[PDB]
Nucleic acid binder design. Structure first.
Length: 61
RNA sequence: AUUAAAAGGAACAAUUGGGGUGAUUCAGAAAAUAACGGGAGAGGUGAAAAUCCAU
């Protein structure tokens, strides 16, 4: 049925921190002390030069 | 022993001054620590490597 801990339509905040050497997609709650899922551009690539590629950003997003 | 220099100095009235000295006072970036979430990467480069990470 429902995923444990999940609720109905709610609000989150995404902390998109994208440098020239990597990119971060990080969503938390309204408080900001609880993180839901944090995926970076380096987890969806193999080489170190593509972590900043726009392709890795959408894949993580 | 002349006058009162678009020479100079002094005085006064109004101001100007990130001019100087002392005290007071505000800011948050960076970094450090404390606690919590998360769970595999992070830095850095032309590409990497050395380095940091399951303590």
């Amino acid at each position: 049925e429902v995923i444990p801990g999940s609720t109905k339509d709610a609000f989150g905040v995404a902390h998109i921190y994208a440098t020239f050497n990597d990119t971060f997609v990080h969503v938390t709650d309204i408080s900001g002390k609880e993180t839901i899922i944090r995926i970076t551009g380096g987890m969806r690539v193999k080489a170190d030069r593509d972590e900043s590629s726009p392709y890795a950003a959408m894949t993580a997003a």
